Amino acid sequence: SRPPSREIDYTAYPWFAGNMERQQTDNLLKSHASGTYLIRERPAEAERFAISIKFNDEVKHIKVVEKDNWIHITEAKKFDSLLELVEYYQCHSLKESFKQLDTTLKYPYKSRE
């Protein structure tokens, strides 16, 4: 009725990128401003997902490690799903994991072309 607990679509979100190339994301974000974030897929071995964010005209990349039915980009904490991982950084600064960075998720990649 009220609770929308009937299959959730992650692709519906504007921050959900498909099989995008590395060089592409670089050029795509190059035009976008700071605060822009996105998540692409990659057919790698240890890494399954790939995250990207723009900060101070610098396109950063974050590898996503998913194993043992759990998701996590670092080697300290774990998540139950990509959503929990995204929402965590969406509200909390990345400085916690990456001291070099101090930004958060605000606008998607397909926000404004």
């Binding site: 974050i62 670092t74 070099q100």
Partner: peptide, 9 residues
């Protein structure tokens, strides 16, 4: 030919 990325460091 190796994954750099940001990484915790």
């Amino acid at each position: 030919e190796e994954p750099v990325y940001e990484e915790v460091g």
